[PDB]
Task: structure prediction
Amino acid sequence: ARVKGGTVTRKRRKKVLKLAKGYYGSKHTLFKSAKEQVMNSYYYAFRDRRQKKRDFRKLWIARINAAARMNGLSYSKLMHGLKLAEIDINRKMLADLAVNDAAAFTALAEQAKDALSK
Amino acid sequence: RSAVRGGGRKPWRQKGTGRARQGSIRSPQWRGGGVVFGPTPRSYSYKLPKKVRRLAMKSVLSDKVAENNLVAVEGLSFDAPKTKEFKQVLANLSIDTKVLVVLENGNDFAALSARNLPNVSVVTSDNVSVLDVVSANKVLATQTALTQIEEVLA
RNA sequence: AGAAGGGAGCUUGACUGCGAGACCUACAAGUCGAGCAGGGACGAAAGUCGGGCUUAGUGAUCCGGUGGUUCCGCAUGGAAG
RNA sequence: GGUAGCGAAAUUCCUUGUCGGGUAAGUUCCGACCCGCACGAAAGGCGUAACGAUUUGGGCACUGUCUCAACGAGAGACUCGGUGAAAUUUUAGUACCUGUGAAGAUGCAGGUUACCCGCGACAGGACGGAAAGACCCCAUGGAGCUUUACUGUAGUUUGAUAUUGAGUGUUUAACCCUCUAACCCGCACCACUAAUCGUGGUGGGAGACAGUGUCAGAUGGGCAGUUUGACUGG
RNA sequence: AAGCGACUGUUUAUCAAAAACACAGGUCUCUGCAAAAUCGUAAGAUGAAGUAUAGGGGCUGACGCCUGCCCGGUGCUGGA
RNA sequence: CUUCUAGUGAGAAAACAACUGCCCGUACCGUAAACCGACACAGGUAGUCGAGGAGAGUAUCCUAAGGUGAGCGAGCGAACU
RNA sequence: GGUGUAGUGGUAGGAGAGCGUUCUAAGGGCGUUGAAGGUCGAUCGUGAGGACGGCUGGAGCGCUUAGAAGUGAGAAUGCCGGUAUGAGUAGCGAAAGACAGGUGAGAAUCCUGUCCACCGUAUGACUAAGGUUUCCUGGGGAAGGCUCGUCCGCCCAGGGUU
RNA sequence: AUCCGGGAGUCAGACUGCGAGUGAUAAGAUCCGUAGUCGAAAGGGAAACAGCCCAGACCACCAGCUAAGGUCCCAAAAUAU
RNA sequence: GUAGCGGAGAAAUUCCAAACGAACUUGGAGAUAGCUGGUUCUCUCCGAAAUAGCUUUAGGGCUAGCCUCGGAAUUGAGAAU
RNA sequence: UUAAGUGAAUAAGGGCGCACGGUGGAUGCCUUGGCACUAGGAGCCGAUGAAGGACGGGACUAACACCGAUAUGCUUUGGGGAGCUGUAAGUAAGCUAUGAUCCAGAGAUUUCCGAAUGGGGGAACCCAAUAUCUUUUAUAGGAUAUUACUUUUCAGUGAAUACAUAGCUGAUUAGAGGUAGACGCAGAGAACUGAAACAUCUUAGUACCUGCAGGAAGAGAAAGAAAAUUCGAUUCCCUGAGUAGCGGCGAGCGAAACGGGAAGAGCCCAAACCAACAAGCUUGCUUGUUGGGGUUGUAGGACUCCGAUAUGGUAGUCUGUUAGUAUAGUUGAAGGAUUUGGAAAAUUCCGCUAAAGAGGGUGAAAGCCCCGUAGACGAAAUGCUGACAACACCUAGGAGGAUCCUGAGUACGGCGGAACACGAGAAAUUCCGUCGGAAUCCGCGGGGACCAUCCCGCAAGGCUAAAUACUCCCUAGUGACCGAUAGUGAACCAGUACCGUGAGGGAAAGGUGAAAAGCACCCCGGAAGGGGAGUGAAAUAGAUCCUGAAACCGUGUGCCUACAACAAGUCAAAGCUCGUUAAUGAGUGAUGGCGUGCCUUUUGUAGAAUGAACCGGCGAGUUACGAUUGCAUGCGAGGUUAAGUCGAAGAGACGGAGCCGCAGCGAAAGCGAGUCUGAAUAGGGCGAAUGAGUAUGUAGUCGUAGACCCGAAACCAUGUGAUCUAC
Result:
């Protein structure tokens, strides 16, 4: 009882080629080229889910430094001041305030300045 | 490889030609070559020990009885082999499924009448197998044939 | 150096059957051994003695030779083996 | 225990030996010398006219061989119309320097330089293409060759015995002989018969020898099958 | 002018034409004819329709002058 | 082919006339585009004939009888081969 | 079922549990009111993988449970087929032609003429091998002819060797 | 951990502390002993870097704290005392 | 005319149908290769070695050591202080 | 207006997404041909001219099928009943109800080559001799028979050499060659390989070559197997058993008899003796020819004595009588309407049939439409197999023990080789070569060297069915076998085209539609090709014709792109363009961070180490038989059958030979819950002390087999080459 290899390989290969839409040239049209490229993209995406969380933290931190130097402080002294006062705002909300509500950011910077005035 | 009508000569040389070393026009990887490990003529049959044969026969008829799926009848007699009268008999006992008809002996008019009905199988009482009883929904056995089966299964 | 070194007397234990338990070790081999039985040497005894202060001096199996034997022996008694 | 003859040689390591010649200048050449690593008399020694698409050194003549290049003719190349391949090829949006790294990077780090697309030319790189290194070692790989490597063998030879018979003598059984009927004849004549084959027949020669069978001892790279270890700064 | 080979000839079809091979001449040795030698299991053949001034085998290689010493070893021949 | 006999062995010499005489090949290429070279391929292929001037000549140059213009072209007039 | 605590990089390799292909049996189904196959979609599951919808297509095919296997492909300087790159690139195989006029859908290349040029111990004439119809006449232009072609040793029809 | 049984793979290692031989107390050399990493290990630091320093990735987050190493600009954090 | 365990050689390992230290074709034959290349779906748990001994042995193998799966067993036999 | 600043848009060409085409032939579905078997037949043809070929025969005839100058066919006996002159269209001529065509049995004709056979030869050609007959006035020309070689029988002639034997002529008798790439019995007879090298040994008396066969062959009727109490010719299967043995005792080779079965069957000569004839006429009875007798071990026969002169069988014939059987055929039940379609067998209603619901066809899927099927019937002729008849053959008891017979250069022995599972071994038994060489029933052979005793047989002569092996071929079927790169090399005009001097090597290539209805007519164009119009359910089904994937080549467009160093992506993200299986939507994307392919082999790779141009198809741990372990089921101190017989190629019962387990120890004699060593009751080794097995299924590993696939250089054995080159 013989088993022809009819329509299984074409389905698997067309599933692979559909993931390669938008690539350059023979990297979206030939199966071997696309196979290798798709493997590399899997590697890159796993790597970059972890690197994302670092990039936004550096972005927030630099915006907060910029805002605080306008209120007579630097980033490190203002973070210490907020900790000595028991304030628990993220660096995300801090930067969001720094860009949207400058008066709220100044209220907070004054609390920090009074905390480390002791 | 060795049964395909083909070649014993080395097709090209072993080196120089910028090629791949090949040994015959009839190798498994050549188009038109011989098959590696195919089907061969084989047997497929074996035997189970004698007590479990007998245990399976008893068990399958006893299952038929434990659900009121065996139907006993005094006799099945016919002066001519007529299919129509057999179908009337079959409805006389309200039988509407696949049925094994177990007959006795040279009851040849009955077996002729019961052939050809597409729900009906006919077997004599010295020739019942395990596969005949499991496939049918009921058994229609005559009184004579029932004692004859009890005589051989003992 | 309570000799394992060196002299004198008598002797053949440079014994037979063994062996609880250890050591070494992939295997095959290698090493030590109290004690029991038979029959002894030396010594008045207690005792010590299964070669030499200790550790090198050796070579599986197959095949062949010599001696022993209360074993087998192709119908039986022998023989060949 | 190397004679005549020859000798830094188609042979001489040291060595470009030393001396004379030829050049302005000569490790090659020619003449000689003898200290011949390692000439030498038929695997011939030393001469030698004629001859050589042989090997070597020097002269005259002639010249684009060269100083040192220039011009000209034709064919390809270049542009247009017709026709129309190939080796190669992981995908390519395919710069340079100093470093790094399987220790010599277009592609990695830091810099420096650079608008997009082609045509005619040159060969520095792509450890460029073509050929699963011919060099070296391994496979308890092969194959051809050698022999005083092992084990065999064709061929040649020597004895016993069968074919295989008969008589005399000489000695301690063996031996020398003589015979004629076997066996042999690539001798002559005759018939089958058109015949240098063959078979028969008669002479002649030779003879229990030879040839042939079985067994035995020698010899046998003529020919055959194989073996010829490992460790190791390759 | 010098080396090699006397000479005409032959050779690695397709990287070597030569100082290599051959050669006329020299010498040693085998062979009395059904010769020795070679093809073949044998029959049959070449040698040769020849017969030692002939036929086979080894070395040297026109021609000129010449070709020393050794028979212990190994082959070959003869011996008893 | 020509003689000489041996030889089964009527009587054939030579005039005219008129009659008889079987089988196979026969085209075309053949110093080539038709054969051998995978090709409409700068190679190879036995024999006979093979003219004039000047010349020893079948050498050499130009020609007679005969054959042919060769199966990619038109321009330009660089490097380099 | 809840809740706690602990664990969960991996080559050679051992152990477990599954996905998909073809065929057999039994059962329950679908199909010209359109099966398999093909193509597209922004859909589902922890993975192999599973659906549903459009277009194409024209006659067969799923699902459940068990069985049996020529049962899964990216690589062997693998084998067969089809198609690219190099690229409109190398080459187009020794040599003298020019013009007028014909034919024709169409002419450097076929026909006819005129002048020019080449071989001439051959590139002339005859023949033995070898080939085997290539020979003659009338038509043709899809392929062969290294371009072209109205032409041909090519193609079609008839005929020729005494 | 030990005992019985089914199935294996491995028998070319490399560098870095430390302590020895060969070497010239040379080698990214060679040969042993002892610990780690690599082999079979991603992530941060060391410009780039198998083997050094920190640390062992089941998965999701645009939340937080630290390690080695750092805070003038490239480039996150002190032009700190 | 001479044919492969062979022929022929004015001798070069030279020729025997473009290949000769032993032609070509078919068969034994799927010769042998301790060597080189390749060996096709998924997820979960665990997870080595590059050493010792012996080897016509040194890039091969065998036994032990080191991994994995199933069972048995008294324990308090394992480890770290 | 002047200065300073910021600055879009515009594409020669390219990228991404999407839409439509072209090329190409994957995928699906399908079969016209294959593969493995079962049951039955048949198992040879040929000098009375084979197997295989060449050349011919048609109204037109290149090819294939058929046939042979009587050529696409002739006669005859049966069947069948309307069309027919093959493929094969196309046309032209015809034939048939006075029976064509077609089908089965028996006949007739049958060129040329070939064993080839009158002589020759480069197969299908050439050349004769002798008789009879023909054309011609005649020669030349045409036809028919006969003519090889050997053997084996008989005449004539015949001689070196007289008698006659070689020889020669004539008549008679048989052979000769091919194959079925199979099966059997003989002769001669390798190598690679395994032994981790290699010589004995293995591969293996295998492959190849040569002879002889037959439908089967071979063996076959005890000089046998054994061991008390025996049995009776041969062959084949199960088991004994991987045992007893053999072996550089290495790799490895490896029995037999007993026990259970299939099938069964026995016969004929030589010799003694007795007659008829011929020669030696010893006129002794020595040589012989025909006929009779006689066939064995419990010894049998001859011979003498009497009985009987009947009765049991055959493996025999091209002799009769029927019975069947193979080769053609006959007959054979039962349905209409409705819906959707081009067309129903599908759907819905309402019926019928079955000793027939196996299968194939029909415009889609049919018990009831067609061919069939279950059942019933049939043969002029020829061939097979039974039965019963004839005819042919063969077959008798009892007693005696005076004498005669019972297979000779044989059995056997020495030497050398081989065959037996048995390699010279302590080597019985059976063969071959060589030499030596018995006895005669008061005898001769065997029981594994050899002897004695006992037991079983009677060599040196011949034949014989069945039970077992194989399939070129014909009939009827079957398959958890293939489905066009598969299955035969070959589904198609294949051993073909093509390649080679030759032996030899050797392919590619299936599919319109239900039906050709295969596109009349018009238009552009030399044509090819195309556009309308028509056929058709559909032409984007139009002959390169089902479906129509990818590489690769184009055309159109939404978004991006000419200051930029890019393993080509990934994460972050403005602008533009859309709007989906509706949800934290889709395409493109300036600009910013990060980032050295895949595979193999390695201590270690981006590697300047290795492989791949790309796309598609194909392409690698399987099976048989054994051994072991785990899981599972049935029985349990027990478990289980093998070959074989009946049965549907099956299930589904018989069959207890045999195998494992239930007891061990020892080299063995032997003893036994114990035994061996030992003087030992000592000690120690191995065992017992409740301590579970066996059959089958399934999976993991191993052995023998090519054993996961591909790959050498080589070795051996038949054959084909001097059309090139050497002499």
About this structure: The first helix of chain A runs from residue 8 to 18. Residues 46-47, 49-50, 52-62, 65, 74-77, 88, 90-92 of chain A lie near RNA strand H (CB under 10 Å from a C1'). The two ends of chain A are 91 Å apart (CA to CA). Residues 1-118 of chain A form one domain.
